[PDB]
Amino acid sequence: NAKIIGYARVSFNAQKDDLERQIQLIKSYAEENGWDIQILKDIGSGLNEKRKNYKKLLKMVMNRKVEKVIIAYPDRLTRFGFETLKEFFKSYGTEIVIINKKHKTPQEELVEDLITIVSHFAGKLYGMHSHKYKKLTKTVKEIVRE
Amino acid sequence: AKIIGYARVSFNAQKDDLERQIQLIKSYAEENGWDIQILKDIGSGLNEKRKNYKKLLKMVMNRKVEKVIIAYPDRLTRFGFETLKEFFKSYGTEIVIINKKHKTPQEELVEDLITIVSHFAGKLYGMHSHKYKKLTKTVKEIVRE
C-alpha cells in the first residue's frame, strides 16, 4: 500500500535494551502523528548488507510499497552508503525520517566495525595471518579495546 | 536501451590505469556486439559524490541503462556493492564485471584504509584530539612504508 515502516538495530545482543529503546522512540513517534506502523529490526552490524529484516525492508521499498522509513539515526540503517540509499529511496517515492539526527552512536559498534574493516583491508594488503596482517590488526585492536 | 562503461582510479598519478580500464571496457563491448558510452571519475570508491558516478546512478533511476560494464567490482564502489547491484536490478540494469579476480591497486587500499580510520577515529574520540591523532598516525606509519 502506502505503508509506514520503522527500522531499528544494534550489532550485539548485549545492546538489546538499547534496541527496545529505539523501538519505543519510533513507536511513540508514529503514535504522536497518528500513524499505523510496522516495525522491523535486526541484531547485526550496519556493515552487513545481508541483514534479514533490512533486506525485507529494501525489497518493500523497491516494490513501491513504502511511503516513509522511520529511523532513530542514520547509522542504524547502514554504516556506509546512506546517501546512495536515500537517493534510491526517493526514486521509489520513499522518504527517510530521522528522529534524532545528532544522537550519540554506540561506541562499541564504532570499535567493532573498525576492527572488522581493518581486518578486511589488512587481508587484501598483506594476506591473512601474514606478519604485516598480524602487526596492523593487533596494533589497532590494542588501541581501541582499552 | 543504453550500455555504460564505468572506469575509476583514485589519483591523478593513476591516469594510465584509468585508460587501461577504458580500453578493456571498449574492446569487451566491441567483441560482444555492444554499443557503449564511457563514464569516468578520478576519485575514491568511498566517495558517494563522484560526479559521473552520481550521473550514472541518476541514469539508472531514469531507466536509461541496460548494462553497466566495469573492470572489477571496487571500481564502482568500495562498499555497498551488493545493495547497489540490487537497486540496479530493480531498474532493469545489469552489472557486467570483466575481470572478477583482478588485483585491486595497493595504494587505493592504503588510502581508503587511512580515510576509513580517520572517519572512525573522529567519531570515536573527536576530530584532532589526542586519541584521534594516536590512532590515525599509528595506522598511517604502518601502511605507508
From Swiss-Prot, chain B:
One of its GO terms (molecular function) is DNA binding. The chain holds residues 63 to 206 of 213 of the full protein. Disulfide bonds: none annotated. The active site is at residue 10. It comes from the Archaea. Residues 2-145 form the Resolvase/invertase-type recombinase catalytic domain. This is Uncharacterized protein MJ0014. GO terms for biological process: DNA recombination. It comes from Methanocaldococcus jannaschii (strain ATCC 43067 / DSM 2661 / JAL-1 / JCM 10045 / NBRC 100440).
